[PDB]
């Protein structure tokens, strides 16, 4: 769970 949230967070934080 946390891993996915963190990954998605980092990813989306960058690319937008």
Structure description:
Helices cover 81% and strands 0% of the residues. With 16 residues, it is mainly alpha-helical. Zn(2+) 2 binds at residues 6, 10, 13-14. This is Amyloid-beta protein 40. The record marks 1-2, 7-8 as: Cleavage.
Topology readout:
Blueprint: H1 2-14
Binding site for Cu(2+) 2: 6, 10, 13-14
Binding site for Zn(2+) 2: 6, 10, 13-14
Site (Cleavage): 1-2, 7-8
Gap from first CA to last CA: 23 Å
Please count the helical segments.
1
Please trace the helix and strand order, writing H or E for each element: H
Largest sheet at a glance?
A: none
Oligomer: monomer
Site (Cleavage): 1-2, 7-8
Binding site for Zn(2+) 2: 6, 10, 13-14
Binding site for Cu(2+) 2: 6, 10, 13-14
Organism: Homo sapiens
Structure at a glance:
This protein is mainly α and 16 residues long. The protein has one helix at 2-14.
Task: Give me some keywords for this one.
monomer, 16 residues, mainly alpha, rod-shaped
